[PDB]
DNA sequence: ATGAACTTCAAAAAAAAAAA
């Protein structure tokens, strides 16, 4: 199902007119297309480049498929009419001649044996007269932009004769048919059966085709080539007898999705997501749709793309799915492709890890809270960072919190450590440090990494007995009383006592609570002083002694307890109510 | 109650816009706003556009924020959208919810950015509150009929044979325009105190800058036709009339999608309007839109159109937008937020960007594009990067929106017929475009302003100092090199013998227009009398933007015929020269940096070396250039035609991405950053101020002559918000790339009188 | 949340100060500067400093208590606390520093829980 | 550079004051909480030694890497404006900068300094490493609430004319902090920290409290500086088998201390002379 | 001759909230 779900959208995108390589071809990224006249005579070396900031090498021309050269005598293979600045010009940037001239001795051979088998084309007779020139090819090096194709190793030049103007020599409706004939005769006399993917006879394809976009080089996604990965003496592709017509389909299915908008990194794991076979598009809804509705394979991938993007957008919505999205989360090994994810499941089922991420991360917010309901990871991790989210450690943090969030894994200790660092370093617990600590501690509980404690809740737990959480609440009420006593404070007992009330409660809370009677005295509403003192009595009723030192477990609680109680105090009528029910 | 809009009256009173009549009037207004398209369909979003305004909370915020009966920012757009999605249909509901929940937050995506799927699922509580408000006091239960069976009519009255998915987004934006126009025209009919828009309340001439539409045609365009034809009868006006005699015969035929193939000086700006207002009167077209790639031809058409039609010509530079005030702007400029004027002339980056917009403000116009005649002058600069979305939407608009896109560029945009590579229809473009010129090719030969000389077909490249000597040999040489750095190199290669004038994007738009104005009067001295000092102008694509320069001879770097045509337009502009001007293309050093520019040369080169470009100003060679050009970059850049293809599934029907396909829809690819380098433009020394932008060419250079001794200062950047005075800043920026910044540490005032650093 | 038999001198002094201020704040409830507002800072740290004076000051609050039996109520729990206080410590230990605030608010809760003192007294 | 390795016990006391306020804890003195014993950061005594050297030396080769308007990258960039502007080849440019910052700044030559910051000046460990100073007995931080008859910005000014901002003055009624320190020879070789700089440091340790007085410190003194000078660059004896020779206890019958006369500082120089000196520099 | 050693292959890939 890993590949029959790729074959079964090649057969969908090839039938949704989405423009996928048709049965013999490949959307190869040809950077430095060659222009020739009708009888040779190199005209121009156009570069079909200029895309995303790393100038990806060429407009994807859907040219005859890359033949997977890959060998010591790699020169013999010679892709049909597009290959290489070493195959087209015999120019070796770093490979040396006789490893580029023998390439050109075979690329010219390939073109010519095409020309004999495909005459009166004026496109291949042109290039076959351009590949029997040795001078116009020399003129290719003396081109205006040749110096920029020599810069890109493995440049793929291809032969657009002039007077076709978009259509390559390998695009004419004879080379197009030749490839549709050279992938229907030569790749049909091979090992007769039987398909792994489709199950049909469909002659077996040894050498699956170089799935591009995963690795540093197009690597054969399914490729058993070492002395023992071969199971039954099957030798490299008969270990997995996938037909040529099916091998091509899923290879060019990955190739487009790793080159399309389907590709997106879940985290450090480039993933191709495509909608499964959509339901028959119930009649009423299909009444308005013309055709009617078509199963565009990559249609609602956004639902899943904007699910993992929701972890950074903070725009997570609990989804109701039943629209199943294939999500093949491949990743490079070295030059194999490691399927790290495979999910035919719905986006609702995929969300169960981000939902648990944004439910373990749920934290109290008052009214008109400037904080998002589900707080974006970059803005969430920005509460761990020095002052702006780029220095949060790209290996135990932003790159691992995401893996701990995308997968409902345990948030690393490096959050308590980092979130606590910032709690007592910014001298305040931003929503985002309280929320992130709530997520850490909830998952530490759920993993049995935080044994005695019970999972935190959104709200303040006017309970919880936790010698760190209740002192966090105590600090929250103490600082609320101070900020209620002195509205404009320059050094709240946060900014002055937090670093040691969080981590060392006897050092401080024995002296915060001498400031406390004075703060209560200064409350202009003495009844408000009574209410706040009542709740600090309630808070401190759960406390039997300020601990000498708060474990890393509880300084997270302190921060969570602080934020819980401080958003309880800044609730509409919470303290007035809770006081009035006593 | 319920208080749709709380306007603190100018008399320190407070008037309440009753949400009853607010929704009723908006629906009625955006029932006429849509024609056969969404007449009763857009109203069902007009009825609902501010349903959430019924929120018991919002009826505590609009009071709190607007000071009615004495700060939370309560959402209200989503509630009407959720109401729609639950009541009408999963299709029609989401269709209508795009409009509704976007009506203030801008058109939203279903998934990616500002996702509707999120907002609706989170609108359940908000919809409960707002619907409780709706039912609580007033508003008879059959006030929101949302009659899907009746609403199925105007959907199927327009979507004959079902809803095309790949262009269902155009309603989602056009009917969105109907809603946002109606709500804005009604909120600001109450933010100004008229309590109505469609009626004489905001139809009063003091409200929204009314302008004559069809009566003015017979008066004033016929006036300037007669007063221009009777002026002269020479080698011109015998073909200018030959243009605007078939441009007038072309208005009869239906052919909803047209194109004007007229070269420079052939009544391009006078017959494009001429065809439009004859095809506007005929085919019930209520508006004429005239779109320009750059805000330079915008001036040359503002002047011409006002000289034709007085003051009706409404405009938005979108870059300059000069800062004159007091009801000449901000009254007529209040009529161009939505183009509710018969003759709107702006750029096809405030047309198409807005015509493909999602933002609430930008989207108010697709109303007025539909059932108009959009004219695209210099349309050959419609970005091939965004050529597929632009051409599909203009094709759809032509097909069923009653528009007539006019491609009144010099050569043509080959905006596709079906440029299909294998079987797939790449850029499924405009079907059967009529060249309103009877003979496209021979007329460009008949109206050939300049004979052109390409570089030798071999690969030899003329050197920078070589072409410096070449242009030193003849006077008044425009020299348009491809890069700003090529402009610096050419300016660093010219002798001090003659005046060398540098013009690259390393300069400021006001300083730019100053340079063009002084070049214009230098040319005038060359014609009327003579300038003994040699004249030339080192330039980049800036002169390529239709600036009125009559250069006898133009050497232009090796790049696209699109740009070669523009260079030729600056050579022998308006004629009055001897037999022909002389434009020569030089294959400069390394050329055409990257992007569309490098593909520009790689096409123009690949023709002259291959037997094409026999006359590389003929339209047949130009269409060949564009035919090559489209199909050489991705004719659809980032995704846009795929983003807006409606993508209907039973669970998430009609999941168009809009703020994804508006944010990614950037015609101006302003890659990098924009630095403002203060070049003191000029001053009248009459308590000066006066950036003097559009009278630079006339007022300054008639009082103070061309002797390069002008002294005047105008300092800006008061560092105040002021909500205005913004076009003294980035009216004067320059746009280095991100590569040129870390090699500069800011080092202000380093931008010289010829360019920046 | 009150360990009436804690014996932690900080905690028993906190309890003692809580009842002392309870009496002061029942002696005259309208009080600008209760002994929390004027004495707590050292009662929590230097119990010998105040707690001597706090009990010069205590019988007079017990007199000022309007409900003469409420005075017995509160004096009884002062004695209940002071059984656990063999001496007012010179300087409260840091553990005891914090436990004094613990005691203040534990015993303050115990006093402001409705029937607790009146009940717990009646089991003596 | 020095050719002996030193391990010193620096007993310094505070009589009525805040030896080292914990910014994490208001300003109340740093305290080992679970034992109540006070703490005085190593950086605190390094600071007062810095203040002493900045006080007395007043000359180049003994600067301090310094007081408030002490943007450290300014001094570091001064290092890169030296003989090693270009001639030291960025790799060892930072090492030549270290050698400079060590030459000029006695702070850097003696204690280390993280100067990798501006025009990177390397990373000096510093031969002299004071430890934290844990008071022998629990400091009974008094936290003397004080008063000011004046306020600050007219936002905390009283709604009547009576301005006052009582504030708090934490004092240790007595604490005999004990700072173990290590003059490591291996890093004296790195910084050029010499026996002259070391005698400066011993003077600084003895006299660093006679000069760094505050309303906060009240009265701090240097009750003893017992320096164990090993024969080798290496350690003749383990450092803590030496520090246990300076046993500081509260005397026989003091419930808790109130002066150095309440501590017996028994120095056991009986057998350390294996190859090694004990010099009672301060006590 | 079989299986390690080696030689070719190919030339990455990049994001991320408002708020009506
Ligand atoms: Mg509204």
Q: Is A298 within 8 Å of A261 (Cβ atoms)? A: yes
Sequence-distant (≥ 6) Cβ neighbours of residue A397 within 8 angstroms: A381, A384, A412, A414, A415, A418
Interface contact flag, C45 D142, Cβ < 8 Å: yes
Tokens encoding A366 = 């008052």
Give the distance, in angstroms, between residue A328 CA and nucleotide E8 C1': 30
Q: Which residues of D touch C (CB under 8 A)?
A: 31, 33, 36, 138, 140-143, 145, 173, 255-256
How far apart are alpha carbons B711 and B450 in whole angstroms? 37
How far apart are alpha carbons B696 and B299 in whole angstroms? 12
Q: Residue B360, CB, less than 7 Å from strand E?
A: yes
For D55-186, strand residue ranges (E) read: 113-114, 123-124, 128-138, 144-145, 168-169, 175-183
Tokens encoding C51 = 């707690």
Secondary structure (H, E, C), B710-757 = CCCCCCCCCCCCCCCCCCCCCCCEECCCCCCCCCCCCCCCCCCCCCCC
Question: Please, what is the angle between helix A352-360 and helix A301-313, to 10°?
Answer: 20
Tokens encoding A379 = 């803005």
Q: Is A560 within 8 Å of A469 (Cβ atoms)? A: yes
The A 5-24 residues near strand E by Cβ under 7 Å are none
A455 Cα distance to chain centroid: 30
Distances from the Cα of B401 to the Cαs of B30, B256, B269, B379, in angstroms? Answer: 16, 9, 24, 20
- What phi and psi values does residue A471 have, to the nearest 5 degrees? -75, -25
Sequence-distant (≥ 6) Cβ neighbours of residue A332 within 8 angstroms: A214, A215, A216, A219, A338
Which of these, B653, B309, B615, lies nearest to B450 by C-alpha position?
Answer: B615
Distances from the Cα of A325 to the Cαs of A285, B121, B286, D37, in angstroms? Answer: 20, 20, 46, 63
This structure was determined by: cryo-EM
How many other CB atoms are there within 10 angstroms of residue B70's CB atom? 6
Q: Is B458 within 8 Å of B560 (Cβ atoms)? A: no
Tell me the CA end-to-end span of chain D in Å, nearest whole number. 26
DSSP H/E element including B394: helix B387-400
How far apart are alpha carbons D221 and D215 in whole angstroms? 15
Sequence-distant (≥ 6) Cβ neighbours of residue B222 within 8 angstroms: none
DSSP, residue by residue, B30-77: HHHSSSTTTHHHHHHHHTTTTGGGG-TTHHHHHHHHHTS--------H
Q: Is A550 within 8 Å of A562 (Cβ atoms)? A: no
Tokens encoding A197 = 């993917």
**Cα torsion A485, A486, A487, A492: sign:** negative
- Kindly state the DSSP code that residue D217 receives in the 8-state scheme: T
Strand partners, B636: B386
DSSP, residue by residue, A7-50: HHHHHHHTTTT-----SSEEEEEESS-EEEETTEEEEEE-----
Place of tokens 């940096």: B593
Place of tokens 């007009």: B46
C61 Cα distance to chain centroid: 12
Secondary structure (H, E, C), A135-187 = CHHHHHHCCCCHHHHCCCCCCCCCCEECCCCCCCHHHCCCHHHHHHHHCCCHH
Which of these, B450, B444, B412, B446, lies nearest to B429 by C-alpha position?
Answer: B412
Q: H helices within chain D, ranges in order? A: 42-56, 72-80, 90-104, 106-110, 185-191, 195-207, 239-243
DSSP H/E element including A330: strand A325-332
How far apart are alpha carbons B139 and B130 in whole angstroms? 12
- What phi and psi values does residue C110 have, to the nearest 5 degrees? -60, -35
The A 216-235 residues near strand E by Cβ under 7 Å are 216-218, 227
Cα dihedral: C35, C37, C43, C46 (round 10): -130
Strand partners, A29: A60
Q: Is A354 within 8 Å of A317 (Cβ atoms)? A: no
Q: Is B306 within 8 Å of B313 (Cβ atoms)? A: yes
User: Could you tell me the distance, in angstroms and rounded to a whole number, from the CA of residue B50 to the centre of ligand 1?
Assistant: 5
Residues, chain B: 757
- Kindly state the DSSP code that residue D32 receives in the 8-state scheme: -
Tokens encoding A350 = 């995929």
- Tell me the Ramachandran region of residue A236: left when phi exceeds 0, alpha when psi lies from -120 to 50, beta otherwise: left
Checking each nucleotide's C1' against the CA of A389, the nearest proves to be E16
Contacts of A306 in chain B (CB under 8 A): 109, 111-112, 115
Which of these, B585, B117, B675, B618, lies nearest to B410 by C-alpha position?
Answer: B618
Q: Which nucleotides of E are covered by protein (CB under 7 A)?
A: 3-4, 6-20
Resolution in A: 3.0
- Tell me the Ramachandran region of residue A106: left when phi exceeds 0, alpha when psi lies from -120 to 50, beta otherwise: alpha
How far apart are alpha carbons A279 and A301 in whole angstroms? 15
Q: Residue A403, CB, less than 7 Å from strand E?
A: no
How far apart are alpha carbons D133 and D135 in whole angstroms? 6
Q: Is A313 within 8 Å of B117 (Cβ atoms)? A: no
User: Could you tell me the distance, in angstroms and rounded to a whole number, from the CA of residue B183 to the centre of ligand 1?
Assistant: 6
Distances from the Cα of B179 to the Cαs of B42, B356, D53, in angstroms? Answer: 7, 16, 77
How far apart are alpha carbons A108 and A89 in whole angstroms? 10
- Tell me the Ramachandran region of residue B248: left when phi exceeds 0, alpha when psi lies from -120 to 50, beta otherwise: alpha
How far apart are alpha carbons A333 and A354 in whole angstroms? 26
DSSP, residue by residue, C43-63: HTT-HHHHHHHHHHSHHHHHH
Cis peptide before B422 (omega within 30 of 0): no
Contacts of C41 in chain D (CB under 8 A): 143, 145
Tokens encoding C117 = 């003192």
Checking each nucleotide's C1' against the CA of A87, the nearest proves to be E9
How many other CB atoms are there within 10 angstroms of residue B709's CB atom? 7
Angle subtended at Cα B55 by Cα B51 and Cα B61, rounded to the nearest 5 degrees: 120
- Kindly state the DSSP code that residue B296 receives in the 8-state scheme: T
**Cα torsion B332, B333, B338, B341: sign:** positive
Residues, chain D: 283
How far apart are alpha carbons B37 and B30 in whole angstroms? 11
- In chain A, breaks (C-N over 2.5 A) are found after none
Q: Residue A84, CB, less than 7 Å from strand E?
A: yes
Which of these, A504, A513, A520, lies nearest to D25 by C-alpha position?
Answer: A504
The protein residue nearest nucleotide E6, judged by CA to C1', is A72
Q: What 3-state class would DSSP assign to B408?
A: coil
A362 Cα distance to chain centroid: 24
How far apart are alpha carbons D72 and D63 in whole angstroms? 12
Tokens encoding D119 = 């025009």
Place of tokens 């109606």: B182
Which of these, B6, B66, B53, B64, lies nearest to B26 by C-alpha position?
Answer: B53
How far apart are alpha carbons B598 and A174 in whole angstroms? 30
Compute chain B's Rg from CA coordinates.
27
Distances from the Cα of B256 to the Cαs of B279, B403, B745, in angstroms? Answer: 10, 7, 56
C47-64: burial string, b at 16+ Cβ within 10 Å, e else: bebbbeebeebbeebbee
A207 Cα distance to chain centroid: 28
Question: Please, what is the angle between helix B561-570 and helix B595-608, to 10°?
Answer: 90
Compute the half-sphere exposure of residue A367: CA atoms within 13 Å on the CB side of its CA.
9
- In chain C, breaks (C-N over 2.5 A) are found after none
How far apart are alpha carbons D260 and D13 in whole angstroms? 7
Is B568 buried (19+), middle (13-18) or exposed (0-12) by CB count in 10 A?
buried
Which of these, A252, A243, A248, A247, lies nearest to A200 by C-alpha position?
Answer: A243
DSSP H/E element including A305: helix A301-313
Interface contact flag, A50 B624, Cβ < 8 Å: no
Question: Please, what is the angle between helix B19-32 and helix B168-190, to 10°?
Answer: 130
Place of tokens 């403002």: B676
Q: Is A295 within 8 Å of A277 (Cβ atoms)? A: yes
Q: Residue A314, CB, less than 7 Å from strand E?
A: yes
Q: What 3-state class would DSSP assign to B520?
A: helix
- Kindly state the DSSP code that residue B703 receives in the 8-state scheme: H
- Kindly state the DSSP code that residue B239 receives in the 8-state scheme: S
How far apart are alpha carbons B682 and B705 in whole angstroms? 14
Q: Is A273 within 8 Å of A264 (Cβ atoms)? A: yes
Question: Please, what is the angle between helix A413-423 and helix A434-446, to 10°?
Answer: 150
Q: Closest approach of chain D CAs to the CA of A492, in angstroms?
A: 10
Q: Which residue of A has its CA nearest to C18?
A: A537
Sequence-distant (≥ 6) Cβ neighbours of residue A473 within 8 angstroms: A460, A539, A561, A562, A564, A565
How far apart are alpha carbons D40 and D44 in whole angstroms? 6
Place of tokens 């010193």: D8
How far apart are alpha carbons B403 and B406 in whole angstroms? 9
Q: Is B56 within 8 Å of B76 (Cβ atoms)? A: no
Q: Is B278 within 8 Å of B269 (Cβ atoms)? A: no
- Kindly state the DSSP code that residue B344 receives in the 8-state scheme: E
Q: Residue B74, CB, less than 7 Å from strand E?
A: yes
Ligand 1 ion: nearby residues, β-carbon < 5 Å: B 50, 183
How many other CB atoms are there within 10 angstroms of residue B507's CB atom? 28
Compute the half-sphere exposure of residue A446: CA atoms within 13 Å on the CB side of its CA.
17
Question: Please, what is the angle between helix A493-501 and helix A505-522, to 10°?
Answer: 150
């Amino acid at each position: 199902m890993i590949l029959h779900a790729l074959t079964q959208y090649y057969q969908r995108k090839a039938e949704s007119d989405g423009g996928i390589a048709q049965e013999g071809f490949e959307n190869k990224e040809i950077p430095f297309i060659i222009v020739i006249d009708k009888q040779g005579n190199f005209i121009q070396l156009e570069d079909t480049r200029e895309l995303k900031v790393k100038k990806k090498v060429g407009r994807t021309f859907l040219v005859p498929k890359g033949l997977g050269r890959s060998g010591s005598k790699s020169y013999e293979v010679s892709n049909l009419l597009w290959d290489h600045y070493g195959y087209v010009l015999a120019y070796a940037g770093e490979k040396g001649q006789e490893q580029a001239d023998k390439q050109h001795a075979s690329f010219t051979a390939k073109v010519n044996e095409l020309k004999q088998a495909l005459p009166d084309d004026a496109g291949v007779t042109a290039v076959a007269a351009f590949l029997s020139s040795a001078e116009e090819k020399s003129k290719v090096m003396q081109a205006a932009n040749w110096a920029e194709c020599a810069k890109v190793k493995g440049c793929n030049l291809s032969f657009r004769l002039v007077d076709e103007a978009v259509d390559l020599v390998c695009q004419s409706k004879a080379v197009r048919e030749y490839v549709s004939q050279a992938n229907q005769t030569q790749s049909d006399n091979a090992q007769k059966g039987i398909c792994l993917v489709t199950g049909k006879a469909a002659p077996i394809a040894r050498l699956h085709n170089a799935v591009k976009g995963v690795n540093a080089k197009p690597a054969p996604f399914a490729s058993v080539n070492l002395s023992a990965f071969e199971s039954y003496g099957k030798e490299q592709g008969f270990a997995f007898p996938i037909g040529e017509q099916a091998m091509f389909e899923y290879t060019t299915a990955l190739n487009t999705l790793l080159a399309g908008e389907n590709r997106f990194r879940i985290g450090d794991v480039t993933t191709v997501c495509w909608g499964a076979k959509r339901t028959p598009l119930e009649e009423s809804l299909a009444s308005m749709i013309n055709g009617g509705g078509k199963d565009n394979p990559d249609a609602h991938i956004d639902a899943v793309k904007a699910l993992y993007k929701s972890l950074y957008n903070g725009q997570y919505c609990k989804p109701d799915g039943e629209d199943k999205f294939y999500l093949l989360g491949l990743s490079p090994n070295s030059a194999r492709i490691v399927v790290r994810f495979w999910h035919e499941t719905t986006v609702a089922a995929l969300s169960e890890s981000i939902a648990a991420w944004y439910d373990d991360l749920q934290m109290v917010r008052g009214e008109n809270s400037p904080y998002p309901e589900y707080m974006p990871l970059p803005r969430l991790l920005g509460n761990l960072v020095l002052d702006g989210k780029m220095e949060n450690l790209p290996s135990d943090l932003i790159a691992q919190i995401t893996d701990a969030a995308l997968n409902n894994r345990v948030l690393p200790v490096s959050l308590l450590q980092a979130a606590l660092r910032r709690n007592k370093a910014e001298q305040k617990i931003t929503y985002g440090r309280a929320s992130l600590l709530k997520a850490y501690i909830n998952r530490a509980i759920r993993a049995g990494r935080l044994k005695n404690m019970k999972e935190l809740t959104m709200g303040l737990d006017r309970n919880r007995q936790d010698i760190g959480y209740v002192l966090g609440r105590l600090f929250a009420v103490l600082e609320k009383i101070q900020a209620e006593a002195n509205p404009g404070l320059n050094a709240t007992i946060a900014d002055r006592y937090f670093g040691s009330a969080s981590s060392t409660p006897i050092a401080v809370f024995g002296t915060l609570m001498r400031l406390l009677p004075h703060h209560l005295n200064k409350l202009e509403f003495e009844g408000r002083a009574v209410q706040l003192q009542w709740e600090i009595r309630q808070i401190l009723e759960h406390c039997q002694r300020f601990p000498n030192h708060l474990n890393l477990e509880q300084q997270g609680l302190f921060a969570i307890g602080y934020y819980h109680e401080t958003q309880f105090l800044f609730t509409k009528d919470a303290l007035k109510n809770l006081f009035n029910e006593a | 109650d319920y208080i749709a809009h709380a306007r603190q009256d100018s008399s320190n009173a407070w008037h309440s816009h009753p949400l009853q009549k607010h929704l009723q009037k908006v629906a009625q207004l955006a029932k006429r706003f849509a024609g056969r398209y969404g007449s009763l369909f857009a109203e069902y979003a007009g009825l609902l556009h501010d349903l959430g305004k019924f929120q018991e909370s919002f009826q505590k915020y609009i009071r709190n924020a607007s000071g009615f009966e004495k700060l939370r920012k309560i959402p209200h757009s989503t509630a009407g959208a959720k109401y729609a999605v639950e009541r009408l249909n999963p299709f029609f509901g989401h269709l209508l919810a795009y409009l509704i929940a976007g009506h203030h937050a801008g058109l939203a995506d279903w998934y990616d950015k500002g996702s509707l799927k999120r907002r609706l699922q989170q609108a359940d509580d908000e919809l409960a509150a707002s619907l409780s408000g709706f039912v609580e006091s007033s508003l008879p239960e059959d006030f929101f009929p949302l009659s899907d069976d009746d609403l199925m009519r105007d959907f199927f009255a327009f979507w004959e044979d079902g809803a095309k998915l790949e262009e269902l987004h155009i309603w989602m934006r056009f009917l969105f325009s109907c809603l946002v126009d109606a709500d804005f025209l009604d909120t600001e009919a109450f933010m100004n105190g008229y309590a109505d828009a469609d009626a004489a309340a905001a139809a009063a001439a003091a409200a929204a800058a009314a302008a004559a539409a069809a009566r003015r045609y017979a008066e004033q365009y016929a006036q300037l036709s007669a007063a221009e034809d009777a002026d002269k009868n020479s080698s011109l006006n015998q073909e200018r009339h030959a243009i605007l005699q078939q441009c007038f015969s072309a208005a009869e035929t239906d052919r909803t999608l047209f194109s004007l193939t007229v070269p420079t000086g052939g009544g391009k700006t006078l017959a494009s309007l001429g065809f439009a207002l004859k095809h506007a009167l005929k085919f019930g077209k209520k508006r004429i839109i005239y779109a320009i790639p750059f805000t330079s031809i915008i001036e040359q058409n503002a002047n011409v159109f006002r000289n034709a039609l007085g003051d009706d010509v409404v405009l938005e530079h979108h870059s300059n937008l000069e800062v004159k005030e007091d009801k000449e702007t901000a009254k007529t400029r209040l009529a161009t937020e939505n183009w509710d004027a018969p003759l709107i002339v702006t750029t096809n980056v405030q047309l198409f960007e807005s015509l493909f917009a999602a933002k609430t403000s930008r989207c108010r116009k697709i109303h007025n594009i539909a059932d108009s005649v959009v004219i695209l002058d210099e349309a050959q600069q419609l970005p091939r990067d965004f050529q597929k979305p632009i051409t599909d939407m203009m094709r759809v608009l032509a097909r069923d929106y009653g528009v007539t896109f006019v491609l009144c560029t010099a050569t043509q945009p080959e905006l596709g017929k079906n440029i299909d590579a294998f079987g797939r229809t790449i850029l499924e473009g405009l079907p059967d475009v009529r060249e309103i010129v009877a003979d496209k090719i021979a007329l460009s030969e008949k109206l050939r302003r300049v004979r052109i000389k390409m570089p030798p077909p071999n690969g030899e490249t003329q050197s920078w100092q070589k072409i410096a000597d070449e242009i030193a040999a003849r006077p008044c040489v425009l020299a348009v090199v491809n890069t700003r750095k090529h402009a610096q190199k050419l300016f660093a290669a010219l002798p001090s013998n003659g005046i060398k004038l540098h013009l690259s994007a390393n300069m400021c738009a006001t300083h730019c227009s100053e340079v063009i104005a002084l070049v214009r009067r230098y040319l005038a001295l060359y014609r009327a009398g003579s300038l003994h000092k040699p004249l030339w102008l080192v330039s980049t694509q800036l002169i390529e933007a239709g600036v009125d320069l009559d250069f006898p001879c133009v050497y232009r770097a090796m790049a696209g015929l699109d740009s070669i045509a523009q260079a030729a337009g600056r050579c022998n502009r308006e004629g009055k020269l001897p037999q022909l001007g002389e434009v020569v293309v030089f294959r400069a050093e390394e050329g055409a940096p990257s992007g569309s520019l490098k593909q520009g040369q790689d096409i123009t080169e690949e023709m002259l070396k291959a037997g094409l470009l026999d006359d590389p100003l003929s339209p047949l060679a130009f269409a060949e250039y564009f035919r090559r050009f489209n199909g050489k970059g991705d004719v659809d850049k980032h995704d846009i035609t795929r983003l807006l293809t409606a993508e209907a599934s039973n669970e998430n029907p009609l999941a168009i991405k809009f703020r994804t396909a508006a944010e990614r829809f950037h015609l101006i690819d302003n890659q990098g950053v924009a630095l403002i380098v203060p070049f003191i433009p000029l001053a009248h020394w009459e308590k000066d101020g006066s950036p003097q932008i559009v009278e630079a060419e006339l007022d300054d250079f008639f009082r103070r002559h061309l002797a390069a001794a002008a002294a005047a200062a105008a300092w800006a950047a008061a560092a105040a918000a002021a909500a205005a005075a913004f076009p003294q800043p980035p009216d004067n920026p320059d746009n280095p790339f991100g590569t040129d910044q870390p090699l500069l540490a800011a080092a202000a005032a380093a931008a010289a009188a010829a360019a920046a650093a | 949340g009150l360990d009436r038999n804690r014996q932690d001198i900080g905690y028993v002094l906190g309890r003692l100060f809580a009842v002392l201020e309870k009496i002061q704040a029942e002696a005259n409830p309208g009080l600008n500067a209760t002994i929390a507002d004027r004495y707590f800072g050292s009662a929590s740290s230097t119990p010998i400093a105040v707690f001597g004076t706090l009990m010069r000051l205590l019988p007079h609050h017990l007199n000022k208590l309007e409900f003469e039996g409420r005075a017995v109520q509160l004096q009884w729990e002062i004695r209940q606390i002071l059984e656990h206080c063999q001496r007012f410590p010179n300087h409260l230990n840091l553990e005891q520093q914090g436990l004094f605030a613990i005691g203040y608010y534990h015993e303050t809760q115990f006093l402001f829980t409705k029937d607790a003192l009146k009940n717990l007294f009646n089991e003596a | 550079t020095i050719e002996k390795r030193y391990d010193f016990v620096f007993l310094f006391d505070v009589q009525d004051g805040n030896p080292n306020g914990d910014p994490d804890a208001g300003n109340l003195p740093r305290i080992d909480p679970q034992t109540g014993e006070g703490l005085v950061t190593d950086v605190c005594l390094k600071r007062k030694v810095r203040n002493f050297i900045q006080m007395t030396q007043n000359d180049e080769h003994h600067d301090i890497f310094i007081r408030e308007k002490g943007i450290l990258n300014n001094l570091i960039d001064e290092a890169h404006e030296q003989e090693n502007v270009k001639g030291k080849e960025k790799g060892e440019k930072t090492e030549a900068a270290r050698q400079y910052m060590c030459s000029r700044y006695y702070d850097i030559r003696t204690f280390g300094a993280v100067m990798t910051t501006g025009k990177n000046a390397g990373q000096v460990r510093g031969p002299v490493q004071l430890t934290f100073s844990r008071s022998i007995d629990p400091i009974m931080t008094l936290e003397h609430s004080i008063t000011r008859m004046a306020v600050t910005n007219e936002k905390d000014a009283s709604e009547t004319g009576d301005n006052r901002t009582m504030g708090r003055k934490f004092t240790v009624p007595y604490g005999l902090y004990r700072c173990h320190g290590f003059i490591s020879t291996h890093f004296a070789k790195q910084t050029g920290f010499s026996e002259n700089d070391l005698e400066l440091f011993w003077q600084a340790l003895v006299n660093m409290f006679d000069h760094d007085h505050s309303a906060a410190r009240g009265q701090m003194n240097a009750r003893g500086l017992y320096v164990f000078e090993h024969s080798n660059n290496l350690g003749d004896a383990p450092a803590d088998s030496l520090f246990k020779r300076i046993q500081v206890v509260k005397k026989d019958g003091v419930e808790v201390v109130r002066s150095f006369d309440d501590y017996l500082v028994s120095v056991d120089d009986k057998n350390l002379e294996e190859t090694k000196l004990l010099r009672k520099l301060g006590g």
